[PDB]
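Figure caption, in words: inputs first, then the predicted bound structure.
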Amino acid sequence: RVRRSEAITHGTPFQKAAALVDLAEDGIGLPVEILDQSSFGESARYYFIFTRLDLIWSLNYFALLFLNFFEQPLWCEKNPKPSCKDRDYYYLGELPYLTNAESIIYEVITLAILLVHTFFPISYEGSRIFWTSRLNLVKVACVVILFVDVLVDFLYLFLPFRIAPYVRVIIFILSIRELRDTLVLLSGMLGTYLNILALWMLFLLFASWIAFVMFEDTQQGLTVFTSYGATLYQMFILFTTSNNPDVWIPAYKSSRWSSVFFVLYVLIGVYFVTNLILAVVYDSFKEQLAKQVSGMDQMKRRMLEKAFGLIDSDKNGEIDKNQCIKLFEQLTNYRTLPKISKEEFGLIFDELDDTRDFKINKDEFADLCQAIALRFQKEEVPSLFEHFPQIYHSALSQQLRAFVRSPNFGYAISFILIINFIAVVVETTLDIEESSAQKPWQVAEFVFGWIYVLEMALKIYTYGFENYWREGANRFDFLVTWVIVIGETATFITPDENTFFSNGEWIRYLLLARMLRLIRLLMNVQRYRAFIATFITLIPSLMPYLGTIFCVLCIYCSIGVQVFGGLVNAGNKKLFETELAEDDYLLFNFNDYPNGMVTLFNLLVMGNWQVWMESYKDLTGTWWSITYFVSFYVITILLLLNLVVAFVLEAFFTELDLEEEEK
Amino acid sequence: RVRRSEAITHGTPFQKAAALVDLAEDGIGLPVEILDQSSFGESARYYFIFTRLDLIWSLNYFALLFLNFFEQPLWCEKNPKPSCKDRDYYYLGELPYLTNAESIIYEVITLAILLVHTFFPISYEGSRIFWTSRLNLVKVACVVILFVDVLVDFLYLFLPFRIAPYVRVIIFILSIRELRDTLVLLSGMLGTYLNILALWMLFLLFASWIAFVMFEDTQQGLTVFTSYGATLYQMFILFTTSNNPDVWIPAYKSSRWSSVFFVLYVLIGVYFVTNLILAVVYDSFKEQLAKQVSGMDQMKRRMLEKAFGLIDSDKNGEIDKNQCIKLFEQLTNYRTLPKISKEEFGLIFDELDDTRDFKINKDEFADLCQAIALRFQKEEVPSLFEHFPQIYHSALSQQLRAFVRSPNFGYAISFILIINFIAVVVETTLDIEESSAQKPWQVAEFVFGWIYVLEMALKIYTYGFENYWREGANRFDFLVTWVIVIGETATFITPDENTFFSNGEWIRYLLLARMLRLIRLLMNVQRYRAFIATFITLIPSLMPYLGTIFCVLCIYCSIGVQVFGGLVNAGNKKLFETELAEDDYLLFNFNDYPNGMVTLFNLLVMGNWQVWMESYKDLTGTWWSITYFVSFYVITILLLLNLVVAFVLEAFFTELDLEEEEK
Ligand SMILES: [Ca+2]
Ligand SMILES: [Ca+2]
Ligand SMILES: [Ca+2]
Ligand SMILES: [Ca+2]
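Bound structure (calcium ion present):
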């Protein structure tokens, strides 16, 4: 019944120790310098008043990234002979470019929020240690670069290019803990990664030399492997199996036996070498992962040990039973424990140890804290609505709480979901058949959204906002319910022909999202339990690595927009000779940021990727351009995708071990 | 100085026990029924006289498979309007089809050798147990099917199709011990592998239904997702990322926001589902592999304990030191051991065990045999040329043997390898520039060939053929050396303008194969030690699994030839509308067996695989045609390829664990 932050700011040393150990078991780590302070009153107060506003900081950071995502392309700022307003001419569109006034206003708001956030910690942390930390200095450097950039931009209304996007992506990276940990792992693994890159480059060079010397006199060498450089380029492309039969079709036409060589080369390359590369990364990742968790454990224990130092003023490493009983009484509130009588506890103690005045030392106290936390679940907060006692204690209210806490509500919700499936599938069937009876079924579907929002309100009322928010799936359900209700009220408030809301089809998809929870029932069977559990666990766990890949994609998009900005034009004559026009890929150019992101995603999956490389090589006229693409393939596909594969495998194995250790 | 086979056929029980424990350490397992026999004299004699001819049996098996590989296509046997002689018309060639007389003679010889091989074991094994074994029964079934097939073929000169190609591939599998074990590994996997396929099929069905209903009203669904059947077909291909931008290029043109759905689906499909499929295959492979090695270990110990039973006639589990010393005396011949004096061993025993008449029990004797072999290397056979003592004991001979066994000989050959590489690169450069000075340099390469055959003769002479053959790397060099001298003398014996041998460019590739030993020198550096060591081990270890994939291709090649034999024709009008003609893929048809193996390899590596599926679907005219390609992707690419990926990863980790425990 005591708030954790209120426990930190004021309370007995026993209350402070209980709250600190609860924080340790939660996993949150307080800043180190705050622990060193004596009772850290003002610093803790400021720290929690800062932490209370985390959502605002995260929203500001996402808005800052979307500012990059929405910025006008630089090449359009330079005067083009046809205006940049013509969307169809440059094969770009479907997002509005911010005007100068709106752009500067949005940037000023974002920069102000970022500045106040990054300079808040100086109030509580202290000047000297704040200036000591390297993270503070790099963040200050990023924010001052942003400030000078926006200042020179405002005064402008010469720079060869705009440096803001990279800086803001970097500061967005430094914002999040998980992204920082991922970068630490990557920096650890790069050292052993480069050696495998060197071996792979040596193998490619040797194979390319063999192929070039073998096919020089033949017609296929005259057609494709004209020189050693082109031979190495084609061999590197073939190593990815992007164009297997295309590169050596003339050799196969000239002589059938030649294919054997290529059959010999692809097999040893794709199956022996590539997998080996993955293996290397795999091992390294595992090792680095261990290091990280080890450090985390140490840090936790360190802060945990502070509690042992906090409870004892004389700090002689002496713990007394009459002193520890207060700690147990404090923890039984935070974590549920069986009711223990004082006489019962005394009998347990004196039968447990024959020696009089037995002492619990620091290490076993730390171990038993972990043991009691792991064995017993946490105790939920009573309520945030508890301030009104009459409504809480009302007979109908307690009957409703008893009803909802029973699983019968769960079976009722599952039955509603099944009826929802029947209704949505029949409505979609009628839509496919283009019958006129779709509207009543759509109106009935609206009632299901009403039922969902009502049940969500009931659950959040009975459990409490924090208890409801604690469950991971509950957050997704809450977001889905709120977006459904927003769409519903937007449609109902205005009886006008909207482009999207008037049709009303969208609602069905939202229901489908809410219905993914049925897949959870499939966890019941033994055959698919491990697969379903691993798939569910991956979604929150795999987020930092996907975010790192996304931010690398953003950096590469920012790089590509400047170099390949205006090359793809409708009036350009050289473009139609390239394969982009032949295959109708012009929509995936690098003209603006969203198109760059889409084409980078397409390059990421290795689906017909060499067409962009050689098309842009022909368009630019310089070989060095391919470096960009080549660099990309080295950075994200061989390293980051293999990292994702390794993480998925490790998660699956840990899930299997956890499943098997139950029996 | 005693032959192992001679030890089995005749000798003291001590010699028999020593030879049996040496066999156990080697890893070869004698047939179970022979062990039960009392001294198994005649059975062992016949068993080793059979084993002496293993090479002939393996050559017969490979010839039998190549018989299928060389057979005339069945559709050409039916009368075509243009003759099958016209190679260019049907886009087939570069291998000669056997005439009826040569075909029947070759098949008769192969079948006779197969029959005598498969019916030899009845002589020693005994009738009842031979008929008891299921492997013998299935092999008899295969051979009798082959016999009746060749008989009806000879009498013919009606069957809807020829059953011979499938049968002779199957009997090839049961021949090799390594391939038999691999199929046992697979049979356990189908239990858990089929379960995941249900989830994968369910995911495709659900995702395709969403995509079909979403885009039905839009323009893109009018073009591509015309019906749900085509929608599932198109979504399945996109799961393989074979055509990522092509499938949803009309949707992207109509509305940019449509890309969000396809980006989301590919990401959750390729990165989550595909890797989870690999994780399931990886875990089952590790589990099933443990079952195989455990059974092999149990079988080895079972035959190992027989020697303990054999040495003790009364078989009361009593081992005597004066009885045991004879075993130690015999093993020092088979495996090198430090010289032990009779009195020295006596002083060892009493201090080691205070109790008088200490007995070695049955169990630890097996464990002792394992311990001694691992720490002490095997003793090489003296020589097969030892029958001539004067040449062996010649003054020059012993000096020559001292030089080669000394390490200094190793540096000399390594120096020659470096010089050879310089000679090759300078000779190849002249060919690129087409200078007239290539011919003098080309002759110098022939001289280095004479060096390699000479050094091979010296090495085999001093070590002996069995010692030389024991090392795996020496076996590779022996074949390379012999193929050089066979080709080298062919040009010299016949001074004529050969199509290939006259040019002489073939020698450089054989020399480069021999210089691959320089890679073994790169193992010294610790940075590249793990990568190179695993790569070398994979080549012999990965053969049984790669062989299984090859045999699966042979079965599908026979199936493809019958159904798609005559579809691809130059005069065929519908063919040019297909994508094979547009992309110039006509040379990869299924017209004959040699072309079928090449095109199936292209489908194996995911390289533009969808063109073959939808070209033959239009060519055949039936939707059931895609069943052949879809079944190929599920059975081979998802299961077998992931198994290869699983094995490569597992081998790498064991290499790291083996290396780290050295320190
Ligand atoms: Ca004390
Ligand atoms: Ca509609
Ligand atoms: Ca005895
Ligand atoms: Ca030449």
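Residues B 312, 314, 316, 318 surround calcium ion (ligand 3) (CB under 6 Å).
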